[PDB]
Amino acid sequence: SMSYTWTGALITPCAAEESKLPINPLSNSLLRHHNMVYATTSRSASLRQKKVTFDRLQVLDDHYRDVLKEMKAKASTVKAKLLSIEEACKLTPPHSAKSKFGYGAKDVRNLSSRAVNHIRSVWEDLLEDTETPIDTTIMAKSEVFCVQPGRKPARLIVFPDLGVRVCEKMALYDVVSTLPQAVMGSSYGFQYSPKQRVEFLVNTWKSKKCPMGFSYDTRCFDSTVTESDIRVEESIYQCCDLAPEARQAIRSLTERLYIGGPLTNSKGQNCGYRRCRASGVLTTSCGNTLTCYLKATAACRAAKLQDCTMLVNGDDLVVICESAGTQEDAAALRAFTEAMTRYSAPPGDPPQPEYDLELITSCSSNVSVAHDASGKRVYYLTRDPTTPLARAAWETARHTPINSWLGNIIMYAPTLWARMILMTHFFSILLAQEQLEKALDCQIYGACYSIEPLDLPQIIERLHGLSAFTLHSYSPGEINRVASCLRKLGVPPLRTWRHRARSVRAKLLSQGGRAATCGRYLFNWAVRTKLKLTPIPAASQLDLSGWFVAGYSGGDIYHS
Numbered sequence: 001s002m003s004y005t006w007t008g009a010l011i012t013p014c015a016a017e018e019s020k021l022p023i024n025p026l027s028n029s030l031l032r033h034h035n036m037v038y039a040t041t042s043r044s045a046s047l048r049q050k051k052v053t054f055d056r057l058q059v060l061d062d063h064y065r066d067v068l069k070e071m072k073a074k075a076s077t078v079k080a081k082l083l084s085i086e087e088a089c090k091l092t093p094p095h096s097a098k099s100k101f102g103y104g105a106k107d108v109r110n111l112s113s114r115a116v117n118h119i120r121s122v123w124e125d126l127l128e129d130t131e132t133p134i135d136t137t138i139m140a141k142s143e144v145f146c147v148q149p150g151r152k153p154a155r156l157i158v159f160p161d162l163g164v165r166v167c168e169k170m171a172l173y174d175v176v177s178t179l180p181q182a183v184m185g186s187s188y189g190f191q192y193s194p195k196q197r198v199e200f201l202v203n204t205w206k207s208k209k210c211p212m213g214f215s216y217d218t219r220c221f222d223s224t225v226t227e228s229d230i231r232v233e234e235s236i237y238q239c240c241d242l243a244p245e246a247r248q249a250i251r252s253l254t255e256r257l258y259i260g261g262p263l264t265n266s267k268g269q270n271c272g273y274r275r276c277r278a279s280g281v282l283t284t285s286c287g288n289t290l291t292c293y294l295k296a297t298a299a300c301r302a303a304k305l306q307d308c309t310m311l312v313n314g315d316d317l318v319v320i321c322e323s324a325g326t327q328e329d330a331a332a333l334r335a336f337t338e339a340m341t342r343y344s345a346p347p348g349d350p351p352q353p354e355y356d357l358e359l360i361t362s363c364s365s366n367v368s369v370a371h372d373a374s375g376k377r378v379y380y381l382t383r384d385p386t387t388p389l390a391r392a393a394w395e396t397a398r399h400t401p402i403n404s405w406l407g408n409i410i411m412y413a414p415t416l417w418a419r420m421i422l423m424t425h426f427f428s429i430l431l432a433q434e435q436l437e438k439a440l441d442c443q444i445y446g447a448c449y450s451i452e453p454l455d456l457p458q459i460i461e462r463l464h465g466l467s468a469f470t471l472h473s474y475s476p477g478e479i480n481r482v483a484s485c486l487r488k489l490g491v492p493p494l495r496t497w498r499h500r501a502r503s504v505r506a507k508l509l510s511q512g513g514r515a516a517t518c519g520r521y522l523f524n525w526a527v528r529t530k531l532k533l534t535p536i537p538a539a540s541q542l543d544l545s546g547w548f549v550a551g552y553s554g555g556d557i558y559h560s
């Protein structure tokens with residue numbers, strides 16, 4: 001069927017939308033080429049719609065079915081807990097889109113009578129009405145990018161009302177947080193922290209006689225997800241031991257919301273109909289991961305690839321297997337893409353066999369190596385800094401709900417560009433505004449957390465280890481990329497940053513407290529007189545577990 005059907009009504013903005021980076025005295029320190037930074041707007045919606053709209057082709061086979069049963073069998077071991085209206089409400093981000101029923105995020109978190117009561121009525125309805133399609137809202141998402149040799153059309157987000165959202169949590173939060181793991185084990189990418197992911201990729205890579213791996217980019221994954229896929233997805237959830245209410249709610253949500261439903265723009269006008277995956281629902285991350293793993297694992301058997309190892313992150317896939325030779329590999333890969341196309345997962349860019357792990361890009365990032373104080377190699381996860389930087393500039397010129405810059409300092413603390421550009425630039429700004437202890441909200445694997453900037457040394461040591469503060473001698477390839485990128489965006493030369501770092505470090509130390517620990521550990525690269533960085537107390541007294549359990553991107557989750 002058609003992934004989409006449009007009435008003709010326009011995907012309307014919900015207010016004034018900014019596309020150009022505003023000129024702020026602070027933005028220029030980071031990059032001078034501000035006209036290269038742009039935020040997507042609803043004005044490009046039409047372009048997007050044309051690309052995500054199309055008829056799907058899906059042919060299932062014996063391999064698909066075999067793998068499915070293997071996954072169901074494992075799911076069978078799971079027992080899911082129904083969440084209480086209270087627990088579910090506490091998971092709602094304080095800035096989630098208000099309900100069209102006289103209550104918003106605050107009320108929900110404040111267990112407000114109106115909020116709690118509508119949510120109850122919504123839940124009741126999910127238990128009685130097993131058919132009526134639930135209304136969803138469609139918006140053009142605003143995201144910042146750097147123009148590439150033209151621009152990207154806004155992505156489209158579809159989500160149900162706040163009421164519905166809380167009910168989703170009630171019925172599926174425990175499932176989407178534990179099932180993926182139970183079904184895919186070490187293949188579930190969200191169980192890993194950046195360091196653990198690298199560990200998994202390197203271990204998996206060395207365990208091969210002659211390793212070969214590729215990244216498989218699926219063309220607009222969400223729109224390739226079919227009614228069948230989503231029902232196969234539910235069949236897996238139905239294998240869990242569930243409370244009657246939770247079970248009915250999963251069945252009703254599947255038929256009324258997940259398989260598709262009406263689309264309404266911000267003006268309350270009917271826009272069309274969705275017959276594929278919505279981006280703004282709780283099962284998006286879990287469902288795409290399950291669906292992508294199922295298809296790839298089956299495709300691999302079909303393509304006769306040898307000893308495949310999947311690493312799935314929603315719609316993101318990276319496969320590492322036993323090479324059977326250059327030609328054979330190239331052929332098995334094409335066979336794999338065809339198996340995937342039949343399964344309704346056509347490729348965006350054709351996949352390419354990689355024989356060098358650093359060249360494989362998965363989850364918009366790759367594995368690279370540098371050296372610690374001792375001089376021993378240390379592997380870390382990095383990525384092209386273009387978007388992180390572009391956004392960092394946007395987040396400097398304007399106040400923003402989430403802070404990608406902070407989320408990036410955390411996930412990419414070991415990286416050359418994160419330590420030289422982001423830490424320097426942002427700490428220097430925080431001092432200028434006397435706001436080091438002010439908690440900031442940022443997202444890790446889609447879920448929001450409030451983090452105090454001054455706890456960055458502990459966090460980093462905990463997730464990455466002390467080497468993150470001493471890494472040097474990066475790879476030629478990594479150095480080249482960062483350099484090319486920094487020059488492209490017009491970012492101050494190395495020398496300009498070292499000077500700014502020496503100054504920020506000094507300013508920080510002369511404050512003691514947690515602000516001093518930041519100066520010693522984070523900017524230890526600036527000074528010639530290195531420091532014997534020892535373990536940090538607060539670092540061991542940390543529990544960053546919830547951080548890397550599952551994916552919730554689009555699920556509207558917030559961890560208090």
Ligand SMILES: O=c1ncn(Cc2c(F)cc(F)cc2F)c2ccc(Oc3cccc(-c4ccccn4)c3C(F)(F)F)cc12
Nearest residue numbers: 416419420471472473474479482483486487492493494525
């Ligand atoms: O391999 C290294 N090993 C150590 N350091 C020192 C260093 C660090 F260990 C960590 C930092 F947090 C900042 C640092 F200093 C490097 C510093 C820069 C560099 O690469 C260069 C070299 C010359 C210019 C530029 C450069 C800088 C800005 C714009 C254009 N080119 C770069 C860079 F983008 F960073 F990749 C490579 C290395």
Ligand SMILES: [Mg+2]
Nearest residue numbers: 191192548549
């Ligand atoms: Mg974990």
Ligand SMILES: [Mg+2]
Nearest residue numbers: 218219220221
């Ligand atoms: Mg895609």
